[PDB]
Short mmCIF file of C-alpha atoms and ligand atoms in Angstrom, two decimals:
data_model
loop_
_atom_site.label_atom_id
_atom_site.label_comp_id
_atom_site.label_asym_id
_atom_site.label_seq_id
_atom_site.Cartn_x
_atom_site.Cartn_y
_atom_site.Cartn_z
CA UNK R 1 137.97 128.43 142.89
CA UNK R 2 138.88 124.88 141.56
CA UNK R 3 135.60 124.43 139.38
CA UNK R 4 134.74 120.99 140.80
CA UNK R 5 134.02 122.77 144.16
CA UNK R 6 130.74 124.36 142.45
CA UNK R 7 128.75 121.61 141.55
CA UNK R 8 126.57 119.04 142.99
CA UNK R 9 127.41 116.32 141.28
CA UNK R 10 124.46 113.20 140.74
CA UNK R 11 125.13 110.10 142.04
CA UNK R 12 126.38 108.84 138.59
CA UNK R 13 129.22 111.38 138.31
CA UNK R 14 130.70 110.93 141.49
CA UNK R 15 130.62 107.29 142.08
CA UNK R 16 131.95 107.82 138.27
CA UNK R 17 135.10 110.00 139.43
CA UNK R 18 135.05 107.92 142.57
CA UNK R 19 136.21 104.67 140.35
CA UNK R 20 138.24 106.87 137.85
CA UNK R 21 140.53 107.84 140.36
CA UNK R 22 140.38 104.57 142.24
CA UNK R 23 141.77 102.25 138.96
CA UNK R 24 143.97 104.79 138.33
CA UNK R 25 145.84 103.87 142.23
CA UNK R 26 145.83 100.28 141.13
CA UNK R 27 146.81 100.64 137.44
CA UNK R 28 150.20 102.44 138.72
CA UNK R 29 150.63 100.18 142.06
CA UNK R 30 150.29 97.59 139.70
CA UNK R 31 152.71 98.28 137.24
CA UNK R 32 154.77 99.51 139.97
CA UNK R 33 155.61 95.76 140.80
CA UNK R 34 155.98 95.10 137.45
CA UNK R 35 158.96 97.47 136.92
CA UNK R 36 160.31 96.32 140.14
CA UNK R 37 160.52 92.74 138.90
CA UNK R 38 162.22 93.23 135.73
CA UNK R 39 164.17 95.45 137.11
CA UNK R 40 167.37 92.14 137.07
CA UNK R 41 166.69 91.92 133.74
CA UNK R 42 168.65 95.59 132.54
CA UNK R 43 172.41 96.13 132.68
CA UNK R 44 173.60 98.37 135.45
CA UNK R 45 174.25 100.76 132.83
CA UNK R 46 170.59 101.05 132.57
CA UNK R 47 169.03 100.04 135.67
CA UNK R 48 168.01 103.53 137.00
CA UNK R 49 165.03 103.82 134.02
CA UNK R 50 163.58 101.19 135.59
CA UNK R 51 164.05 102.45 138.91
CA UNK R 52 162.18 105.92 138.02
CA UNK R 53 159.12 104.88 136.47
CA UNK R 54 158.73 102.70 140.01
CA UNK R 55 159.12 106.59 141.74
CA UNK R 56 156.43 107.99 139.18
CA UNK R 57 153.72 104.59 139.65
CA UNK R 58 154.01 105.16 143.61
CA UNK R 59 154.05 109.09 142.96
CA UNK R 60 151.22 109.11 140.97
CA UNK R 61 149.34 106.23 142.68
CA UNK R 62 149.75 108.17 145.84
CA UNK R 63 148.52 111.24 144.36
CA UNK R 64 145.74 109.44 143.05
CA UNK R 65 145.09 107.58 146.38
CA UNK R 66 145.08 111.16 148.06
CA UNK R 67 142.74 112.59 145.03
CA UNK R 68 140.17 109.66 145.48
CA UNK R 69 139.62 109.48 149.66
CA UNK R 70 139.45 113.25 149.00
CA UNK R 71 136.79 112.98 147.07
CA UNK R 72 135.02 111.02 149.02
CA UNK R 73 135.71 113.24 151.97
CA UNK R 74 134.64 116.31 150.31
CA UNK R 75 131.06 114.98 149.08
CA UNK R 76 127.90 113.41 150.83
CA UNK R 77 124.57 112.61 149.07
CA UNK R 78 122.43 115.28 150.27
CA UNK R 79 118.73 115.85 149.34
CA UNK R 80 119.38 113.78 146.20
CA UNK R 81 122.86 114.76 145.00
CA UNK R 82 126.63 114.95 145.93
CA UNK R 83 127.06 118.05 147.43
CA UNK R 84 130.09 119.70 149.07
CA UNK R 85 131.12 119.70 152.85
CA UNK R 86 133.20 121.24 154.50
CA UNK R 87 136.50 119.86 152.79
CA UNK R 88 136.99 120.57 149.33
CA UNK R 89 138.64 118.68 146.44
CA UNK R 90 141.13 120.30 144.09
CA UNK R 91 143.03 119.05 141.35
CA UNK R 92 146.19 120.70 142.77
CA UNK R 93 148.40 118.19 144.38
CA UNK R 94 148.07 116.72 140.46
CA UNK R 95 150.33 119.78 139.67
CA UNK R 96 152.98 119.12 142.33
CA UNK R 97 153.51 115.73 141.24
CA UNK R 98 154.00 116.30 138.07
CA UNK R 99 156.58 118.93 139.65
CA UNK R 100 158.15 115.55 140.68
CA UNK R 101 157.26 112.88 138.33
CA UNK R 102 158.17 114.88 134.56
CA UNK R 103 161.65 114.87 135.57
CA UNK R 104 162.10 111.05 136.58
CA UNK R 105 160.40 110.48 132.75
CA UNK R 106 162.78 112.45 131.13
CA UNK R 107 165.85 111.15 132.81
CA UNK R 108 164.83 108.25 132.04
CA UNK R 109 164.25 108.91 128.31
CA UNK R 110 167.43 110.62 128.33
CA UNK R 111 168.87 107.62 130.01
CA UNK R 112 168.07 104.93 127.52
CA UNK R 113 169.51 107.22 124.83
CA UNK R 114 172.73 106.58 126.26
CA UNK R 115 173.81 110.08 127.17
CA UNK R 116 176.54 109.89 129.64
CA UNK R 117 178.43 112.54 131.18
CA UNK R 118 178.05 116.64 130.94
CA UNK R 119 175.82 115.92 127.96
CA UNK R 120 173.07 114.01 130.49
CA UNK R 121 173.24 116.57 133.35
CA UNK R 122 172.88 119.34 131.08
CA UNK R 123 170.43 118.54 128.87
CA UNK R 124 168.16 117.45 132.26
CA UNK R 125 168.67 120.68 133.26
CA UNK R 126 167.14 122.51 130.71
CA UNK R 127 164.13 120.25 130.45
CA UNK R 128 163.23 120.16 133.90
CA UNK R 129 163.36 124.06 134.45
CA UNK R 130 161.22 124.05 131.03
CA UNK R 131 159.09 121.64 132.15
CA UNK R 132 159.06 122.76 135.86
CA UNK R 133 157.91 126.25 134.23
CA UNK R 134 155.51 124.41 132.30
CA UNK R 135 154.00 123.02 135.61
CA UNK R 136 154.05 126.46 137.91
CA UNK R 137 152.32 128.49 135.09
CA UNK R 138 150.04 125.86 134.49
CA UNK R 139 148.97 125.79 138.48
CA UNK R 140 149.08 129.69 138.63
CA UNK R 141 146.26 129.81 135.71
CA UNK R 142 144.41 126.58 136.84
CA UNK R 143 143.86 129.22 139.84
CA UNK R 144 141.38 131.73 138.10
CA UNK R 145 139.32 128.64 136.23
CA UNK R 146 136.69 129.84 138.06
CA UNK R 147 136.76 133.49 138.45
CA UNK R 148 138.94 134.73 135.19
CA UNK R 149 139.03 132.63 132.74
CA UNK R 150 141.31 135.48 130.75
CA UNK R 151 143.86 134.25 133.50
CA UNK R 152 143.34 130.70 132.62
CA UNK R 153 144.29 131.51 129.24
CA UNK R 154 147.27 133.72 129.59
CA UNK R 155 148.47 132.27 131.92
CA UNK R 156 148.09 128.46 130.28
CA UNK R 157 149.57 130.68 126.80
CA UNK R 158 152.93 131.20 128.51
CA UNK R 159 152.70 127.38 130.30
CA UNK R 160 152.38 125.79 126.51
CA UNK R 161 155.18 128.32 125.94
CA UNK R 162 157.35 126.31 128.32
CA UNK R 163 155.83 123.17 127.01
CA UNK R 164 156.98 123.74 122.80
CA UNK R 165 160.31 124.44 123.60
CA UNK R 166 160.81 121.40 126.17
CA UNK R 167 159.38 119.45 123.54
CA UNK R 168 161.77 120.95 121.20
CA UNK R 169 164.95 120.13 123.41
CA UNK R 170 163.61 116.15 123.63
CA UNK R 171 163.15 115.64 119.74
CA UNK R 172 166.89 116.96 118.69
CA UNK R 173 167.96 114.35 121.69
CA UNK R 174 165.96 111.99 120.54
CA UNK R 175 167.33 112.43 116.41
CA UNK R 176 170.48 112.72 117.07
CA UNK R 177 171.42 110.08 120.03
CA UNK R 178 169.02 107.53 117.70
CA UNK R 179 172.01 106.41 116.34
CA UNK R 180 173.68 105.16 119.43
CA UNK R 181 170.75 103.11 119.60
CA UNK R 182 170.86 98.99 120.00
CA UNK R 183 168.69 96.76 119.66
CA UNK R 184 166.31 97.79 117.16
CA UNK R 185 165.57 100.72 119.59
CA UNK R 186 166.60 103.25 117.62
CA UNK R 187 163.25 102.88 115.96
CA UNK R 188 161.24 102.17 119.14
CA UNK R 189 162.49 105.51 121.12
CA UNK R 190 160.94 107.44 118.15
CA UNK R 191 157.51 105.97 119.13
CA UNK R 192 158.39 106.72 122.67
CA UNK R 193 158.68 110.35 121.66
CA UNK R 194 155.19 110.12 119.42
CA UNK R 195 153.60 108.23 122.34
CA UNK R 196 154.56 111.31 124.94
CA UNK R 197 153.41 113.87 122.59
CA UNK R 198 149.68 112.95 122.56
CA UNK R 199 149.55 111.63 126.25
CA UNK R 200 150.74 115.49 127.23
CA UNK R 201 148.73 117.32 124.73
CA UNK R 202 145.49 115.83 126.72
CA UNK R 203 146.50 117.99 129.62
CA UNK R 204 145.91 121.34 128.09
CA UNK R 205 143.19 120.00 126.81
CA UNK R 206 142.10 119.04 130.24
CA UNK R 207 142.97 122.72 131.70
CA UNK R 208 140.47 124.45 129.28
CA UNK R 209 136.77 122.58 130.22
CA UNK R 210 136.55 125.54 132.19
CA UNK R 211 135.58 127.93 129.24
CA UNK R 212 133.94 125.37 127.23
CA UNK R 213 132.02 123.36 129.19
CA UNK R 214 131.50 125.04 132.94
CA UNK R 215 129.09 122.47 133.90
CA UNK R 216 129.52 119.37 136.49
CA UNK R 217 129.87 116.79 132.94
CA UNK R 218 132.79 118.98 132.57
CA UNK R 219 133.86 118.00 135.62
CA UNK R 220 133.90 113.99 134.92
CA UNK R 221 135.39 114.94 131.19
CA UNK R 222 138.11 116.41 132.90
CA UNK R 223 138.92 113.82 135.39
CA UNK R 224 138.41 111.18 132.54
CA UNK R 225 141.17 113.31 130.44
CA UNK R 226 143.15 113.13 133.27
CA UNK R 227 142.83 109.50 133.58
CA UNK R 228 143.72 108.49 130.11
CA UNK R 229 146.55 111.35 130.53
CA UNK R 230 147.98 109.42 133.33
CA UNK R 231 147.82 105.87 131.79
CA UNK R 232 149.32 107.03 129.07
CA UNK R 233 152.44 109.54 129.74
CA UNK R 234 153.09 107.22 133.08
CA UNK R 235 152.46 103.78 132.95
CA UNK R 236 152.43 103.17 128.56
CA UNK R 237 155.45 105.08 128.20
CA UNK R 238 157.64 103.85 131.17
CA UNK R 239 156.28 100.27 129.49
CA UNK R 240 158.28 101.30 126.61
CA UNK R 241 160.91 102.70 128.23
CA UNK R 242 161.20 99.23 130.05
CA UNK R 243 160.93 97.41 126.63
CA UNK R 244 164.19 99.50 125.37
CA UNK R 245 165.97 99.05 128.64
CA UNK R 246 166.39 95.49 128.57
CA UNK R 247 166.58 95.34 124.69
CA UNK R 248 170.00 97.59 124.43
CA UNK R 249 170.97 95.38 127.74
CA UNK R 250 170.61 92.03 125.65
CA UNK R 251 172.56 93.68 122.71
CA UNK R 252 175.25 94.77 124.80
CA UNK R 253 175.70 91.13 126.71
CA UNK R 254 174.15 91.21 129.78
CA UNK R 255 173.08 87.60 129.68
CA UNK R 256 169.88 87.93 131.90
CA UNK R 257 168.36 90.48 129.26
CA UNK R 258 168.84 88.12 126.42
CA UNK R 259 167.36 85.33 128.92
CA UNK R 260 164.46 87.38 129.23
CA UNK R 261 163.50 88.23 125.89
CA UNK R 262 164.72 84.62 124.98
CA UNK R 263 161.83 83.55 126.92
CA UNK R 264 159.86 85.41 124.40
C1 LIG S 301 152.69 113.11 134.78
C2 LIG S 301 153.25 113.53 133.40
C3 LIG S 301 152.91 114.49 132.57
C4 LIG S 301 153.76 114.46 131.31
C5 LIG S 301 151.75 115.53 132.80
C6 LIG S 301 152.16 116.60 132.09
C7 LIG S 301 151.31 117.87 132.04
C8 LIG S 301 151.46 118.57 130.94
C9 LIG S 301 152.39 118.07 129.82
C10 LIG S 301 150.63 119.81 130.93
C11 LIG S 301 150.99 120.97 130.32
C12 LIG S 301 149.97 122.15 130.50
C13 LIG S 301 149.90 123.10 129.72
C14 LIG S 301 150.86 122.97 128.58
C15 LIG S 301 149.16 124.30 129.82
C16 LIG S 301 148.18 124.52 130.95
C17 LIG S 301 149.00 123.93 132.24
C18 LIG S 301 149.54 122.36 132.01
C19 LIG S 301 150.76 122.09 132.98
C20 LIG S 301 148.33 121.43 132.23
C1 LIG S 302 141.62 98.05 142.57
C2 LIG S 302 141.57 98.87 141.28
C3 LIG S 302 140.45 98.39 140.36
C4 LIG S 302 140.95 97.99 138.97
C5 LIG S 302 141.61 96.61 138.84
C6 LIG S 302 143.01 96.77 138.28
C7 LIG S 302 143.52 95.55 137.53
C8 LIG S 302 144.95 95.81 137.05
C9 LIG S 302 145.13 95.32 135.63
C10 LIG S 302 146.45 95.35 134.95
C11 LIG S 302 147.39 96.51 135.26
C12 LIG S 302 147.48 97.43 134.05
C13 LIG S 302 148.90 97.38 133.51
C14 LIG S 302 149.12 96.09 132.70
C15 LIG S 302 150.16 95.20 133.42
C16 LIG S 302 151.58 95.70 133.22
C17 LIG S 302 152.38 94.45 132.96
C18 LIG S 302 152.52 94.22 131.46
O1 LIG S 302 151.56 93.91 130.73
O2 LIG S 302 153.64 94.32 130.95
C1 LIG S 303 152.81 92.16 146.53
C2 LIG S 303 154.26 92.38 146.52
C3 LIG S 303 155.12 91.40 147.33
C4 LIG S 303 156.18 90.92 146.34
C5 LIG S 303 156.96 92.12 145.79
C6 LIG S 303 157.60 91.79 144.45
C7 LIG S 303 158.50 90.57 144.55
C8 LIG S 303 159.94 90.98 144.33
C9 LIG S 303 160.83 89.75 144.12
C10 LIG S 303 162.04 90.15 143.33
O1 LIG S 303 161.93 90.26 142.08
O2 LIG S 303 163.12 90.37 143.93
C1 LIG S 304 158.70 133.52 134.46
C2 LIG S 304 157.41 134.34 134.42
C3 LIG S 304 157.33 135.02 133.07
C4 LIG S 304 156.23 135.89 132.63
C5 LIG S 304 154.81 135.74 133.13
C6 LIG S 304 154.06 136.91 132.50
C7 LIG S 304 152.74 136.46 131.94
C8 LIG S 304 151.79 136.13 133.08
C9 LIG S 304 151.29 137.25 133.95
C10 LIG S 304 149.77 137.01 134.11
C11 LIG S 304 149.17 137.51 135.42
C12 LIG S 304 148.16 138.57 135.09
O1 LIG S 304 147.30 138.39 134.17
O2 LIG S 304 148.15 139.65 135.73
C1 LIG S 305 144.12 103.90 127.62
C2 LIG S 305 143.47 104.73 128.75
C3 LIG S 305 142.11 104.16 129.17
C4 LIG S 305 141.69 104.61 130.58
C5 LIG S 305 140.36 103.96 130.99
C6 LIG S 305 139.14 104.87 131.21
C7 LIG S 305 137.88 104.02 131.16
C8 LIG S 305 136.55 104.75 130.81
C9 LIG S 305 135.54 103.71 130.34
C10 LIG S 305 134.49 104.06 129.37
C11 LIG S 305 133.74 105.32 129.59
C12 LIG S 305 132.30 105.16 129.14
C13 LIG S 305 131.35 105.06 130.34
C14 LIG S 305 130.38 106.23 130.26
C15 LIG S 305 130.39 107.07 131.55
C16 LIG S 305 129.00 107.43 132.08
C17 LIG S 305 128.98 108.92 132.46
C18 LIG S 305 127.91 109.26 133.54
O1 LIG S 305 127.66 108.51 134.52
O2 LIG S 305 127.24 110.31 133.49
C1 LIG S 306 144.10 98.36 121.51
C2 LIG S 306 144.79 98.74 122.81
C3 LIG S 306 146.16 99.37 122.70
C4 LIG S 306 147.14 98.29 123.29
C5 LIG S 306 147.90 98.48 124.63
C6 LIG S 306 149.21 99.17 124.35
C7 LIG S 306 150.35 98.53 125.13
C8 LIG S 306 151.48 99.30 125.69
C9 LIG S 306 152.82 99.36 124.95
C10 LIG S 306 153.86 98.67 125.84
C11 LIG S 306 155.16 98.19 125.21
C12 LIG S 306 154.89 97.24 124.02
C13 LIG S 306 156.07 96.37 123.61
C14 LIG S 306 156.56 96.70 122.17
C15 LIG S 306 157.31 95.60 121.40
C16 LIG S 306 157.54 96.15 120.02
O1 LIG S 306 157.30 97.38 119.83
O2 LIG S 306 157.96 95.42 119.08
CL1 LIG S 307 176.23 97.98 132.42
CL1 LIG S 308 152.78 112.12 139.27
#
């Protein structure tokens, strides 16, 4: 049903997905240390960004991981092409991840705006349900890419739904906790929010090559959408979210922030 599973793919296309998904493992693995490193140089106040985007590089590296040896599982060169086997690869365990990693970016969005108490917990709330409905209508229509499109549409019309008005709740956060911004960050966070809209826009864009281009290039567009999708909403922006971290840290005394960027 998944519309990878009905072409066979030349040996350029899947050695290309092969390596798409395989730099994509070390890419997050790799920042993954990264986060865990710097993670002395934020305040306990904001510690736990940090923490999350090292949940999201191991959730999505090991998503990835799974993606890539299941590619390679699914596909042997036969008779001059990749062609399926008896397992099959699907983009699906994407989906539940992002079940699991959108929250830990928004907390920690919503962290570094320096929400604290029934403010924080509420506002996650409502964004994870809107994003978590996001996610399930998204998988429900990614379901019928093969055998009704019309499914695929309505069914991704009621996920972007979900996704306007969970963009909707981050932006008034974003205006109006600005100001309780140090650092400089009050500025920066506004990019972060700029930054996440285009790196999620590229997934609907990545759930329609189904009715535009139902052929195997489609296929390799989609998994290079994906890609860039990943790089972008995962490691760029918990980059940033790191940079504000330990800026608001250094502003607010903890000496090994302002060591840190003193370096610098
Ligand atoms: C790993 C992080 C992110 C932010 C991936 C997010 C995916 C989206 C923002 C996708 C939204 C989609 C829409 C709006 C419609 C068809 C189904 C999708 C979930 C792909
Ligand atoms: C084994 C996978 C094949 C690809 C090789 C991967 C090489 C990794 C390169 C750099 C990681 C990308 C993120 C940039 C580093 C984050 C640290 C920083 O610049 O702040
Ligand atoms: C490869 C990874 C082995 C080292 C893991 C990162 C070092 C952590 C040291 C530290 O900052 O506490
Ligand atoms: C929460 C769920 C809210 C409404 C979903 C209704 C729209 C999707 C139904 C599409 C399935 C179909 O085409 O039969
Ligand atoms: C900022 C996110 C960047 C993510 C990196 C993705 C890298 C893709 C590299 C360039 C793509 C051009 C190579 C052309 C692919 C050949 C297609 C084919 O074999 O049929
Ligand atoms: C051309 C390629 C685009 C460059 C790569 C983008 C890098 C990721 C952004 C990570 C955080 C950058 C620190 C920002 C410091 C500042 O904004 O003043
Ligand atoms: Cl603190
Ligand atoms: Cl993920």
């Amino acid at each position: 049903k998944n519309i990878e599973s009905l072409f066979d793919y030349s040996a350029g296309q899947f050695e290309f997905i092969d390596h798409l998904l395989t730099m994509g493992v070390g890419v997050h693995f790799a920042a993954l240390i990264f986060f865990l490193v710097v993670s002395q140089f934020v305040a306990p106040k904001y510690r736990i960004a940090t923490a999350l985007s090292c949940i999201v590089m191991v959730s999505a590296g090991l998503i990835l991981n799974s993606q890539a040896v299941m590619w390679t599982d699914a596909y042997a060169y036969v008779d001059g092409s990749y062609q399926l086997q008896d397992l099959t690869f699907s983009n699906g365990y994407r989906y539940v991840n992002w079940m699991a990693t959108i929250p830990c970016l928004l907390l920690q969005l919503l962290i570094v705006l320096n929400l604290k108490g029934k403010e924080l917990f509420s506002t996650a709330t409502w964004l994870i349900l809107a994003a978590w409905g996001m996610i399930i209508t998204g998988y429900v229509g990614q379901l019928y890419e093969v055998d009704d499109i019309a499914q695929l549409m309505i069914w991704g019309a009621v996920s972007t739904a979900f996704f306007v008005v969970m963009n909707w709740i981050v932006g008034t956060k974003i205006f109006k906790n600005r100001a309780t911004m140090l650092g400089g960050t009050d500025s920066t966070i506004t990019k972060v929010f700029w930054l996440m809209m285009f790196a999620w826009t590229l997934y609907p864009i990545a759930y329609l090559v189904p009715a535009f281009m139902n052929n195997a290039d489609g296929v390799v567009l989609r998994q290079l959408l994906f890609t860039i999708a990943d790089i972008s909403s995962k490691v760029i922006y918990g980059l940033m979210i790191t940079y504000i971290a330990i800026q608001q840290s250094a502003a607010a005394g903890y000496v090994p922030a302002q060591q840190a960027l003193g370096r610098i």
